[PDB]
Amino acid sequence: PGLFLTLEGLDGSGKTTQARRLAAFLEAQGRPVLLTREPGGGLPEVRSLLLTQELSPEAEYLLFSADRAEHVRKVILPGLAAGKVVISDRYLDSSLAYQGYGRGLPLPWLREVAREATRGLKPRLTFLLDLPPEAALRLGLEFFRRVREGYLALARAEPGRFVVLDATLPEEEIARAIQAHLRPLLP
Amino acid sequence: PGLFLTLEGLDGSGKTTQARRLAAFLEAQGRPVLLTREPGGGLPEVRSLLLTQELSPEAEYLLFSADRAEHVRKVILPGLAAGKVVISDRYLDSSLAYQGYGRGLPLPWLREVAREATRGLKPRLTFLLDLPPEAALRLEGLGLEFFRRVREGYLALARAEPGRFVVLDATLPEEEIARAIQAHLRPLLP
Ligand SMILES: Nc1ncnc2c1ncn2[C@@H]1O[C@H](COP(=O)(O)OP(=O)(O)O)[C@@H](O)[C@H]1O
Ligand SMILES: Cc1cn([C@H]2C[C@H](O)[C@@H](COP(=O)(O)OP(=O)(O)O)O2)c(=O)[nH]c1=O
Ligand SMILES: Cc1cn([C@H]2C[C@H](O)[C@@H](COP(=O)(O)O)O2)c(=O)[nH]c1=O
Ligand SMILES: [Cl-]
Ligand SMILES: [Cl-]
Ligand SMILES: [Cl-]
Ligand SMILES: [Cl-]
Ligand SMILES: [Mg+2]
Ligand SMILES: [Mg+2]
Ligand SMILES: [Mg+2]
Ligand SMILES: [Mg+2]
Ligand SMILES: [Mg+2]
Ligand SMILES: [Mg+2]
Ligand SMILES: [Mg+2]
Ligand SMILES: [Mg+2]
Structure with missing residues (x-):
């Protein structure tokens, strides 16, 4: 049982906000x-x-991956075995976008590192809250361009797992779109 | 330029003792x-x-690896680039023996993580101080069974790379170990 969902984007793309609203929505339907x-x-x-x-x-990728490894084992996997909808604000895609496309580390190496850290646990649906770094509500600008494009590149590689949302829209209608995509995966 | 050396063995095998003696022995010979x-x-x-x-x-191995990646980039390679003899008390082999043979993590994964962590950098010589497991004396669940697996792991890593490893008997007195280490160095120096 259980359903694994993630949210991704630049800092200030509104991930925590939408994570908060998605939880509230599922609580309102009685879903743990x-x-x-x-x-x-x-x-x-x-x-x-x-x-x-x-x-x-x-070095910084390996620390993120150690954290991720404990996270997957002590929090996420247990949550899913109890039948809960687990929602992570940032997951593997953050490392791929930031350390991969941003800092330039080779993606194949990252995923080979990630494979044991995560046990190959991939979320069913990842919501990308996309916007330009200048529009974000909270190493030059060029680094942040590379991370955003990296996210978009990841999304177009897996169109089945990514749902790309225009993060500049009002938070209420962004919430309803997430709800729309998510509806088929619940009763 | 430069020479990369390492000391390996179980907790309490004399690694730290011998690395410090070696360092001092090389400094007295006028080498950086x-x-x-x-x-x-x-x-x-x-x-x-x-x-x-x-x-x-x-997570344990990825923590060791985070440290190893930073250690290679900021300390070891810049030291070697300046022609220093760089001696590390523990390196990648610690992970292979502890986290591979000890914890049971797959060696190929460990090595794949290591490639970018170390950038391929291997020491020229590695001094394994082979100590009996019962003599070994922080980390989670460091039991006797674990130490047997780690000890035998070190010995298997020695056999797989017999030109890099020099296996020495850690129960021998400290002067004799140091003299034996020094003798394996002599051809690699002047
Ligand atoms: N050849 C030896 N024989 C007996 N005791 C030793 C020998 N070499 C070192 N020791 C002692 O054993 C203890 C552990 O030595 P240490 O160098 O800290 O091991 P390691 O660095 O491998 O953990 C110390 O108290 C040290 O004085
Ligand atoms: C470098 C390294 C150490 N270790 C272990 C060996 C030791 O139990 C512990 C710390 O090593 P060390 O610092 O040499 O011992 P001490 O803390 O007594 O000075 O970490 C690994 O398991 N894997 C590794 O890759
Ligand atoms: C999870 C994760 C975060 N980060 C960084 C990107 C963000 O700037 C920052 C977010 O931290 P915060 O959410 O505590 O503010 O962490 C990575 O670079 N890689 C990762 O894998
Ligand atoms: Cl799922
Ligand atoms: Cl955010
Ligand atoms: Cl993933
Ligand atoms: Cl060899
Ligand atoms: Mg992390
Ligand atoms: Mg990872
Ligand atoms: Mg992708
Ligand atoms: Mg020591
Ligand atoms: Mg070594
Ligand atoms: Mg490593
Ligand atoms: Mg053996
Ligand atoms: Mg070997």
């Missing part, structure tokens, strides 16, 4: 829900360490 | 030496991270 996030959900100390320190991309 | 270690040489804060309760073996 669990919110969680990366970084921090597996190893909170990773999150606080990366906050005040910049490393090499390789 | 960089003494380093793992975990912590790349990312000091990883030792905090590694103590986390009930840490899965995958």
Whole structure:
């Protein structure tokens, strides 16, 4: 049982907001829900360490992946075995967009690292809240362009898992679109 | 330029003792030496991270690897580039023996993670201080059964790369181990 969903986008694309509203929507239908996030959900100390320190991309990816590995094991997989709808604000796609397309690390290596860290757990549906970095409500601009395009490139590679939402629209109608796509996967 | 050396073995095998003796022995010969270690040489804060309760073996290895990636880029390669003899107390082999043979993680995955973590950098010589498992004395569930697997793992890694590894008997007195290490170095120096 259980359903695994993720949200992705740049910081200030409104992921937490939509994660909050999606939880509330599923609670209103009586469906058990669990919110969680990366970084921090597996190893909170990773999150606080990366906050005040910049490393090499390789080193920083491996920390994200250790956190992810604990996150998948202690939080996400248990939640799904209990029949809950688990919603993660950021997951693997964040590393692929930021460390891969942004900092330039090779994608095939990242996914081979990720495969054991995640046990190959992929979300059923990932919502990409897309906007230009200048429109975001919260290493130059060029880095943030690369991450956004990277997200869009990931989405067009897997059109079955990504749902690309224009994040500049009002939050209420963005919420209804997410609800629309999600409807078929519940009764 | 430069020479990359490492010390390996179980907890309590004399690695730290012998790396420090070696460093000092090379400095007295007038050679530039960089003494380093793992975990912590790349990312000091990883030792905090590694103590986390009930840490899965995958996260464990990825933590060691985060540190290793930073350690290679910021400390080891720039030291080697300047012609220093760089000695690391523990390197990739620790992960292969502890997280591979000890925890049961697949070696090919470990090595695939290692490729980009180390950028292919392997030491010229690695001194394995082979210690009996019962003599070994932080990390989760460091039991006797674990140490047998780790010890035998080290010995299998030695057999697979017998030109890189020099296996020495860790129960021998410290002067004799150091002299034996020094003798395996002599052709690689002047
Ligand atoms: N050849 C030896 N014989 C007996 N004891 C030793 C020998 N070498 C080191 N020791 C002692 O064993 C302990 C562990 O040594 P250490 O160098 O810290 O091991 P490691 O670095 O491998 O953990 C220390 O108290 C040290 O004095
Ligand atoms: C470098 C490394 C260490 N370890 C383990 C060995 C030790 O039990 C622990 C710390 O090593 P070390 O710092 O050498 O021992 P000490 O803490 O006594 O100074 O980490 C691994 O499991 N994998 C690794 O890749
Ligand atoms: C989960 C994850 C986050 N990040 C970064 C991108 C964001 O700027 C930042 C978000 O942290 P925050 O949500 O605590 O603000 O973390 C990555 O670079 N890779 C990842 O895999
Ligand atoms: Cl699912
Ligand atoms: Cl957000
Ligand atoms: Cl995924
Ligand atoms: Cl060899
Ligand atoms: Mg993470
Ligand atoms: Mg990962
Ligand atoms: Mg894709
Ligand atoms: Mg030591
Ligand atoms: Mg080594
Ligand atoms: Mg490694
Ligand atoms: Mg053997
Ligand atoms: Mg070997």
